[PDB]
From a paper:
We solved the structures of efmSHMT in complex with pyridoxal 5ʹ-phosphate (PLP) and (+)-SHIN-1 in the absence or presence of Ser at 2.28 and 1.90 Å resolutions, respectively, to characterise SHIN-1 binding to efmSHMT. In the complex structure with (+)-SHIN-1, electron density was observed in both binding pockets of the protein dimer, and the (+)-SHIN-1 binding sites were well resolved. The C4′ carbon in the PLP ring was covalently linked as a Schiff’s base to K226, as previously reported for the huSHMT structure. The solved structure showed that (+)-SHIN-1 binds to the folate-binding site of efmSHMT. The exocyclic amine in (+)-SHIN-1 forms hydrogen bonds with the main chain of Leu117 and Gly121. The pyrazole moiety forms a hydrogen bond and van der Waals interactions with the main chain of Leu123 and side chain of His122, respectively. The cyano group in (+)-SHIN-1 forms a polar interaction with the main chain of Ser344. The biphenyl moiety in (+)-SHIN-1 forms hydrophobic interactions with Leu117, Leu123, Val129, Pro352 and Phe353. Moreover, the biphenyl moiety hydrophobically interacts with Tyr60 and Tyr61 in another monomer unit that forms the efmSHMT dimer and the exocyclic hydroxy group hydrogen bonds with the main chain of Pro352. The crystal structure of the efmSHMT/(+)-SHIN-1 complex showed that the pyrazolopyran core of (+)-SHIN-1 forms several hydrogen bonds with the main chain of efmSHMT and that the biphenyl moiety and hydroxy group of (+)-SHIN-1 are important stabilisers of the interaction between efmSHMT and (+)-SHIN-1 because these moieties interact and reduce the flexibility of the 115- and 343-loops.
Serine hydroxymethyltransferase (SHMT) produces 5,10-methylenetetrahydrofolate (CH2-THF) from tetrahydrofolate with serine to glycine conversion. SHMT is a potential drug target in parasites, viruses and cancer. Here, we investigated SHMT as an antibacterial target using E. faecium and (+)-SHIN-1. DLS measurements indicated that the hydrodynamic radius of efmSHMT was 4.209 nm with an evaluated molecular weight of 97.2 kDa (theoretical monomer molecular weight is 44.7 kDa), suggesting efmSHMT forms a dimer in solution.
Residue numbers in the entry:
A (entry chain A): 3 to 411
B (entry chain B): 2 to 412
Write the structure that this text describes.
C-alpha cells in the first residue's frame, strides 16, 4: 500500500527477491540473513542519533539504544573471547580504516597479503586508502603449493622491518597459521593485525583457529560467514588499544552509528551463540570440501592449492580456454552466480582474471547438503566444459532449477 | 513474534525504544521519523546483495535489479537538487565528506571551514577528526555581537592563508548561508568550494534555502535530517572530472560494498521529497522554528544565539539560568524532552559541558505539530529550565509533553 506511491522502487525489489530465489549464489562473501536480522534493520532505530558509546553519548534518549549496542558488544566478546569489542564500524573497510589508525602512522611500512594471492583491497592495494596511506609490502603464496610460505613471509619481514603485519584474506581457502604470524611479528618487532571477515563464522564455531589471542587487533565484517547484517567490527585484548580503536572509529572516521544495523549485529551474534550455528558451519566446510573433490577430479577446473579448509575455493579455468570473466558470464547465463577472481601469480587484468571464486555459505544456508553441493559443482563443470553448447547449457539450467525448487527461501 | 521469542533481550529493548519515540518530544535538530516505506526498504532482502562497483560496472553479476534501485536513487537525487552527477554510496555524512576531500585536496593542504564552537561540524576541521588530522584547517566563525558569519572575515582569512579549498555548511548554525558570497571569496583566492548541506538538504530541496549545488565544486549531504531519508551520505557535483574522482574515492577508495538496502531507502526518500507536499512540510518546519524562537526570545534565561532562525534549528545559551548545556539537556531529559547539549560561539566551558542546547523542529513537524504546538513546546522548555527542580512545575511539563504526544501520535 505504501508501495503504491513508488511503484518503480518496489517492483525492482520484488524482481530481486525473485532473482535470489531462482539463482544459485556461489559468491563466497554472500549469505542470507534471518528474518529477525532484516526486522532489526527495518526498525525505528534508524531514527536515533547516538554519537558516542553506551553510557557516554553526546545527547539524550539513548537509554534503550544502549541496551541494543551493549548486547552487540557483549555477544561479540562471548563469541570470540575478546576483552573489548567495537560494533560501530559501518563496514569491514571502515573497521580496517580505524584499526590501522590505532596501530600505525601514515607512511609506515605494513606487510600484507598480495591481492592476487588472495588478499583484500584494504590490505594494501594502491587504489585503496590502505595502499595510498601506508607503505605496503606484499607477501603471497608459494607458486607450486599455492599456500602461504611462512619462511618467505619471515624473510620479507626481516628485510622490510614493518611496523605492522596483516593476516587474513578474501580468496584464500587454507588455514591461516596465526601463531606463526605472531612469531614472525614478534621477531621483527611489528604488531599483528588479523582481518577475519571471511572466516569469522568459522572462528565463532570453533572450526578455524581463533586469531584474537594472537593479534593485537582483529577486524571483521558482520556479514559473510557470520550471517549478520552488512557492517564491521573491531576486537582487541589490550585496553590501551581499545581506547585508540574507540577514538579512531568516532570521532575519528565516523559520525553517528547505524543503530538499526547494530541491532541486527546483536541478533546475528545470538544466532551464532546457538549450537545450531556450529552445525551450520560444519556443513559450510563439508559442502566446500565436497565441491573441491568434484573439481579436483574434473577436467579444466584446477582448484588452487588442491584443497580447501574453509568455506571457499578458487578455480583456475585457463585450461578451458577461457578467463574468469567469461567463466563468470557462462555460469550467470545458467543462473549460477560466482565472481571472477585473480589467482596467485595472475597474468591477466584484474578485470578479466584467470579464475573464479566459489563459496558455500549461502547455499548451505538454503539447506544444501554435501549431496546437493556435489551436484552444484557438477553443474558448474558441465556449464564450463560445454563450449557454447545450448543443449548442454539448458540441461544445466534445468539442474539449477531442480536445486532451487528443492531448497526455496 | 517467533523470532522475538528467541531473543527477548534484543526485542524488548526495541519495544522500549518504540515507546520512547512515541512518548518523547524529539527536539534533536538532526533527527526525524522516516516513513514506513523507508524502513521497509532497509528491512528488505537487499542486505544480502554484494554490489561492489557502480550500476553498469559492478565487479560481478547478479546486480540487474540492484542497478535499477541505485539508479533510481541517483536519478532522483539529480532531480531533487539539480546536479549533473550524484553518488549515493557513502555510508554516512562523514564518509561523504571523506571522499569529497579526497577529490579536492591532498593531505596537508590548507582548508577553510567553520569552527566547531561557531556551528561547524566535526568533519570541518576538528583535530580529533580525520579532517583536522589529515589537512591544515583554518577556522572561521561568527561575529561575537551578531553571531552570524562575517563574510569580510572569511575574505580576510582566505586571502591571508590562501586555502586550496573553502568549506561551507554547519551543524549548529540557524541563519541563511550565503553560498554566492562563498563562491566569490573562493574565486578571488583561487580556492575550490565545498558545501556540506547535511542539515539543510531538505530545506534546499523544498526551495526554502538557497541551493549550494550551482556554486559548490562538490556538495555533500546526509540523506537523513531534514531530507528525512535513511541514515547515509551523498555526494553531488556538476563537474564531470570531479564526478570521476568522487566515484573513485568512494569505491574502492574508502569503502567496499555499499549498503544497497539503505540505498533503496534513499530512493524511497528522494521520491517523497519530490512530492509537492514535502515543500509544505519543509515550510512548516521553518515556521515552527521561528515560532519557537519568538518564545525563547521573550524568556530571559533562554538567549537564542544570533536572536533569530532562518531554518529548522536554534542554538540556546542557557548560562543566565545558572546551568550549563549538560544540565539543561538532562533537566529536559527528565521531563521527556530530548535535545543535545551544544557549544555556542566563543564557548568558555568544556566541550563536554557546553554553554548551550541545540533544538530543531524537523521531527515534531513530521508528526504534525503546527505553530500553536511549536509555541507550547518552547513554553514547556522554558518552564522546565526555570523550574529549579520544583517537581510540581516539572510534572506540569511532563503533562504538557504527554498532551502534545497524544495529540500527535506516530505512525
Ligand atoms: C572488490 C575486492 N576487494 N578486495 C578483493 C576484491 C576482489 C576483486 C575482484 C575483481 C573482479 O574484477 C577486481 C578487483 C580489483 C581490485 C583492484 C583493482 C582492480 C580490480 C578485486 C573480489 C573478492 C571481489 C578480489 C580479486 N581478485 C580479492 N582478492 O580481493
Ligand atoms: C558530535 C558532533 N559532530 N559534529 C558536531 C558535533 C556536536 C558535538 C556535541 C558535543 C556534546 O557534548 C560534543 C562535541 C565534541 C566533539 C569532539 C571533541 C569535543 C567535543 C561535538 C553536536 C552537534 C552533537 C557539535 C557541538 N557542540 C557540533 N558543532 O558539531
Ligand atoms: C569483504 C572484506 C572486507 C570489506 O568489507 P566491506 O563491508 O565490503 O567494506 C574487508 N576485509 C576482508 C578480509 C573482507 O573479506
Ligand atoms: C550530521 C552531519 C555530518 C555527519 O553525518 P554522519 O552520518 O553522522 O556521519 C556531516 N556534516 C554535517 C553538516 C552534519 O550535520
Ligand atoms: Cl570479499
Ligand atoms: Cl549534527
Amino acid at each position: 500500500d505504501y508501495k503504491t506511491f513508488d511503484p518503480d522502487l518496489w517492483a525492482a525489489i520484488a524482481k530481486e527477491e525473485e532473482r535470489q530465489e531462482h539463482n544459485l549464489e556461489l559468491i563466497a562473501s554472500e549469505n542470507f540473513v534471518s528474518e529477525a536480522v532484516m526486522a532489526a534493520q527495518g526498525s525505528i532505530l534508524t531514527n536515533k542519533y547516538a554519537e558516542g558509546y553506551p553510557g557516554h553519548r553526546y545527547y539524550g534518549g539513548c537509554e534503550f539504544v544502549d541496551i541494543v549496542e551493549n548486547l552487540a558488544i557483549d555477544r561479540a566478546k562471548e563469541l570470540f573471547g575478546a576483552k573489548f569489542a567495537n560494533v560501530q564500524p559501518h563496514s569491514g573497510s571502515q573497521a580496517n580504516t580505524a584499526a590501522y589508525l590505532a596501530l600505525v602512522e601514515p607512511g609506515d611500512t605494513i606487510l600484507g597479503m598480495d591481492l592476487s594471492a588472495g588478499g583484500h583491497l584494504t590490505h594494501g592495494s594502491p587504489v585503496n586508502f590502505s595502499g595510498k596511506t601506508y607503505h605496503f609490502v606484499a607477501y603471497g603464496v608459494d607458486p607450486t603449493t599455492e599456500v602461504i610460505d611462512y619462511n618467505v613471509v619471515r624473510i620479507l619481514a626481516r628485510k622490510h622491518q614493518p611496523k605492522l603485519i596483516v593476516a587474513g584474506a578474501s580468496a584464500y581457502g587454507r588455514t591461516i597459521d596465526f601463531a606463526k604470524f605472531r612469531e614472525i611479528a614478534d621477531e621483527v618487532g611489528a604488531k599483528l593485525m588479523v582481518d577475519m571477515a571471511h572466516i569469522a563464522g568459522l572462528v565463532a564455531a570453533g572450526l578455524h583457529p581463533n586469531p584474537v589471542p594472537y593479534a593485537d587487533i582483529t577486524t571483521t565484517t558482520t556479514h559473510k560467514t557470520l550471517r549478520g547484517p552488512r557492517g564491521g567490527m573491531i576486537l582487541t585484548n589490550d585496553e590501551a588499544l581499545a581506547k585508540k580503536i574507540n577514538s579512531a572509529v568516532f570521532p575519528g572516521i565516523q559520525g553517528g552509528p547505524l543503530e538499526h544495523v547494530i541491532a541486527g549485529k546483536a541478533v546475528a551474534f545470538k544466532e551464532a551463540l546457538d549450537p545450531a550455528f556450529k552445525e551450520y558451519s560444519e556443513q559450510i566446510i563439508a559442502n566446500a570440501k565436497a565441491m573441491v573433490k568434484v573439481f579436483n577430479q574434473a577436467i579444466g577446473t584446477r582448484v588452487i592449492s588442491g584443497a580447501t579448509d574453509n568455506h571457499l575455493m578458487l578455480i583456475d579455468v585457463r585450461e578451458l580456454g577461457i578467463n574468469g570473466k567469461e567463466a563468470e558470464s557462462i555460469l550467470d547465463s545458467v543462473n549460477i552466480t560466482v565472481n571472477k577472481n585473480s589467482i596467485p601469480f595472475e597474468t591477466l587484468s584484474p578485470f578479466k582474471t584467470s579464475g573464479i571464486r566459489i563459496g558455500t555459505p549461502a547455499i548451505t544456508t538454503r539447506g544444501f547438503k554435501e549431496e546437493d553441493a556435489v551436484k552444484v559443482a557438477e553443474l558448474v563443470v558441465k556449464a564450463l566444459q560445454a563450449k557454447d553448447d545450448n543443449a548442454q547449457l539448458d540441461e544445466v539450467k534445468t539442474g539449477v532449477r531442480e536445486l532451487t525448487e528443492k531448497f526455496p527461501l
